[PDB]
């Protein structure tokens, strides 16, 4: 649901927020992902 605030349980990682398209150059090994304060900010949908 890329644009509506949602409770997510992505691979055990529970939390709440919104999901939008991202161009993060996640080289093909980068997964959970985070930010400057090291807080999960970008999860590559494992299925897609």
């Amino acid at each position: 649901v890329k644009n509506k605030c949602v409770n997510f349980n992505f691979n055990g990682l529970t939390g709440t927020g919104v999901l939008t398209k991202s161009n993060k150059k996640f080289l093909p090994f980068q997964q959970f992902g985070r930010d400057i304060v090291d807080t999960t900010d970008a999860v590559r949908d494992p299925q897609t």
């Binding site: 993060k24 150059k25 996640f26 080289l27 980068q30």
Partner: protein
């Protein structure tokens, strides 16, 4: 077989500060 290499080094437990580039890539690192 059929018919100038072997560069070996040993790593150590050290603290490093790594400079990341905008595309997620490591441009420079400094050994504290």
């Amino acid at each position: 077989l059929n018919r100038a290499d072997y560069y070996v080094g040993y790593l150590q437990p050290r603290t490093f500060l790594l400079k990341y580039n905008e595309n997620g890539t490591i441009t420079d690192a400094v050994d504290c």
